[PDB]
Amino acid sequence: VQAEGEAEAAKMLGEALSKNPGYIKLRKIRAAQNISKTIATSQNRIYLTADNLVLNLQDESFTRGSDSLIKGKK
Amino acid sequence: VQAEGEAEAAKMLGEALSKNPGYIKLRKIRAAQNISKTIATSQNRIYLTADNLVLNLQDESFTRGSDSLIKGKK
Amino acid sequence: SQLITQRAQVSLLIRRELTERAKDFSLILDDVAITELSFSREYTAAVEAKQVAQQEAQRAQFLVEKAKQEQRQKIVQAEGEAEAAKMLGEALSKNPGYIKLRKIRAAQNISKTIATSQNRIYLTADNLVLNLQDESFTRGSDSLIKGKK
Amino acid sequence: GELITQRELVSRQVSDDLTERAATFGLILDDVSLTHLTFGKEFTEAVEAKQVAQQEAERARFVVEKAEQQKKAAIISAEGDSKAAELIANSLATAGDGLIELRKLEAAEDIAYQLSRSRNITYLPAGQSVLLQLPQ
Amino acid sequence: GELITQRELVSRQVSDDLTERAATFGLILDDVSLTHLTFGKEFTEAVEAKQVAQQEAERARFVVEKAEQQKKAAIISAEGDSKAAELIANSLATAGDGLIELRKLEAAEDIAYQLSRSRNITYLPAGQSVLLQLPQ
């Protein structure tokens, strides 16, 4: 009975989301929110990547990774 | 009721912006504004990229990344 | 709670039984009255909190309204950044005259204020001037040659 | 519970038993009853909680109505960030890559006018096989 | 609320009850009433807030009109930066790569005349497989 709980929850997460990464990304990202809200209680030494804090600002990497908005450069 | 709030807001952000990256870039960029306005309260060690602070000034990378204005070099 | 709510019943029953308890040994009790009453809190704590929150609901409903309307504050806030976008937008669709010029008045005022900063800047092919004769220099200069740009 | 949902019986039993008890020792207990009385904690306290939280029920019933009106704020800190999207999306869709572009570099200013308040920003190119090493 | 939207009833009830009460103890309460009176906080204070923020409504109604006229400044710190674009764009489009170019290096001066006030600038080439290492 413990883990029919984690299995029917899996039912209704499972039949639920098979279209496109709307909330799976949103939840990666509410992760980015609450995760590193609690990294406060942490002492994480984080080290990062291409376009996270913002600043490939004009390198073509920036703008091609921005033109996902151009439907075709995504 | 908490997160119908984040869902109908998603409605009216969603049907709203499916043309071209006008404000999505503008908001990347008002990000660049307020984000690093508040990086003041931060102590960020930022490290940067091809054409952010301005100065590929004549390298062909500069001018081809500038001739986006030439309709075809964008 | 039923003690607090019906403390009259409690004190009345106490006196009713105690007068007959005392009268057995020739003791006429004119008065028998409860002087104090206590609990831990929990029953009454939740019982109070229910009406606390019932009207906290009201406390924030009119705030819902206040906010419905403090959002046309923001409506008017950012038509400002949108019509400015109109007249920046229909304005510049030819060639990078001022967009470069403004990259470059950036290079001006940006690093004018990098004074108030402590930037450790690190730089690139032809910024401070000195590929002076390397063919990279001269091909990145012959943009002036109409065709080497 | 039965000790005091029927305490009259308990006290009377102890009292008459003790009276007949003292009688044998030449002692007339003209009256006796239970001075003090208690129990453990949670058979004691949980039938209490039974009606405690039948009212905790109303407490939460009504904290629900508080949250109903709290989360309007989460709606509404973003409502206008979204209408601005309404506007500028169909603006520079038909219009083109004008302020798609140029606010990037009204940014550059407002960006690092403030990055000055930061003190360790850095920079590199691309188009090469650019390859980073960084300081302490 | 009902205690004092109808306090006359509450005080009169307490008063006549206490008068008949003291009568049995040989005491003529010729008058009685509720000296002191209060409640909790927020059933108390939120029906208050109900009309508080019906006026907070006007407060925000009118802070809206303040922002209307604040954000002209955001328009107008950039208005002229833009007309200069109007001008020089069609200037050196027809004209060519003259001051497209030469202000780069009236820059070089005004750039590092001021970079002097900075104290850790550095420099490298390209055209090679240039590869950076930097100091502390």
Author numbering:
A (entry chain A), B (entry chain W): 226 to 299
C (entry chain U): 151 to 299
D (entry chain V), E (entry chain T): 137 to 272
Excerpt from the paper describing this PDB structure:
Prohibitin complexes are dome-like structures consisting of prohibitin -1 and -2 heterodimers that assemble in the IMS via their N-terminal transmembrane helix. Prohibitin-1 and -2 (PHB1 and PHB2) are members of the Stomatin/prohibitin/flotillin/HflKC (SPFH) protein family. Among other proposed functions, the prohibitin complex supports cristae architecture and negatively regulates the activity of the matrix-resident AAA protease (m-AAA), which cleaves numerous matrix and IM proteins. Three-dimensional (3D) subclassification of the subtomogram averages revealed two distinct conformational states of the prohibitin complex present in untreated and OA-treated cells, both of which resolved to approximately 20 Å.
We termed these two conformational states “open” and “closed” on the basis of detectable protein density for the dimeric membrane-anchoring domains of the prohibitin complex. Density for all 12 heterodimer pairs was visible in our initial subtomogram average, allowing us to model a fully enclosed dome complex. Finally, the top of the dome is assembled by tight packing of the C-terminal helix C-α2, leaving a central pore that is formed from the disordered C-terminus that forms a beta strand complementation with adjacent subunits. Prohibitin 2 contains an additional C-α3 that sticks up above the dome cap. This fully assembled closed prohibitin dome is approximately 20 nm in diameter and rises 10 nm above the membrane. We refer henceforward to the fully assembled state as the closed conformation. The closed conformation manifests additional density extending 3 nm on the matrix side of the IMM, while the open complex is associated with minimal matrix density. An additional unmodeled density occupying 180 nm3 was present on the matrix side of the membrane which cannot be accounted for by prohibitin itself. There is insufficient unmodeled mass in prohibitin 1 and 2 to account for this density, which therefore most likely reflects ordered portions of prohibitin-associated proteins or alterations to bilayer organization. Quantification of the two populations of complexes revealed a statistically significant shift from 75 open to 56% open after depolarization, indicating that the prohibitin complex is basally in a dynamic assembly of states and that depolarization drives the complex toward closure. Under depolarization, prohibitin shifts to the closed “inactive” state, which could, in principle, reduce the degradative capacity of m-AAA with respect to integral membrane proteins of cristae.
